[PDB]
């Protein structure tokens, strides 16, 4: 079934919402949520300024996600 997203401080689980993501080369980038899979519990993250070929599915409990600084 579809799952309510976890409580994650500072992250809004909406399409287009911004956050920072750690890419596969271990650098943080401002990013936005492209898609949310509520069944598998993961989101398609787009790294801002970069090609969509780098869009990555990240599980929504991942420590590779952090909120923007408020």
From Swiss-Prot:
Q: How does it assemble?
A: Interacts with methylated DNMT1 (DNMT1K142me1). Interacts with SOX2.
Q: Which domain of life is it from?
A: Eukaryota
Q: What does this protein do?
A: Is a negative regulator of proteasomal degradation of a set of methylated proteins, including DNMT1 and SOX2. Involved in the maintainance of embryonic stem cells pluripotency, through the regulation of SOX2 levels.
Q: Which gene encodes it?
A: PHF20L1
Q: Which residues of the full protein are shown?
A: 5 to 70 of 1017
Ranges for domain Tudor: 11-70
- Where is the protein found, in the record's own terms? Nucleus
Q: What is this protein called?
A: PHD finger protein 20-like protein 1
């Amino acid at each position: 079934g579809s799952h309510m997203p976890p409580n994650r401080p500072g992250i809004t689980f909406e399409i287009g919402a911004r956050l920072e993501a750690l890419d596969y080369l271990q650098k943080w980038y401002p990013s936005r949520i492209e898609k949310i899979d509520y069944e598998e519990g993961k989101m398609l993250v787009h790294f801002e300024r970069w090609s969509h070929r780098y869009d990555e599915w990240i599980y929504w409990d991942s420590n590779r996600l952090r909120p923007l600084e408020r």
